[PDB]
Amino acid sequence: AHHHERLRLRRDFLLIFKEGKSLQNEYFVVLFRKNGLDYSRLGIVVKRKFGKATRRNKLKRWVREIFRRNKGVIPKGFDIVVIPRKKLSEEFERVDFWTVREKLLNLLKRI
C-alpha cells in the first residue's frame, strides 16, 4: 500500500467535531478521532478571518510540513483537524515556523 496523510475533510469535519476529542493552546485547537487505520491523517481548517489567501496558504503549508516530518512523535490511528486561533492570527507576522511547530507538536503529542 502507498502512504497517505490527507483527511476527507468535507466528508468528516462534522463527525470529528461532534464525536472526537479536542485539545487547545493559545495558537491552535486540535480535534481528533480514531480512524481505524495504522496511520494518522490531517485536515486543516483556516477561518477566512485568519488572513487573506497568502497568509492562510502559508499557515497550511507550515502545518502540513510539521505533520509530515514529525510522524514519529504523533500518535498513529487518528484523524486530526487543526484549527488556528485568533491569537495566532494576531501574532502570525511576529513568529516563525519553528515557534508554530513547537506549539502544534505540543498538542499533537498529547493525543
Ligand SMILES: O=C1c2ccccc2C(=O)c2c(O)c(O)cc(O)c21
Ligand atoms: O472549533 C473550536 C473548538 C471545538 C471544540 C472544543 C473547543 C473549541 C474551541 O475552543 C475553539 C476556539 O477557542 C476558537 O478560537 C476557534 C475554534 O474554531 C474553536
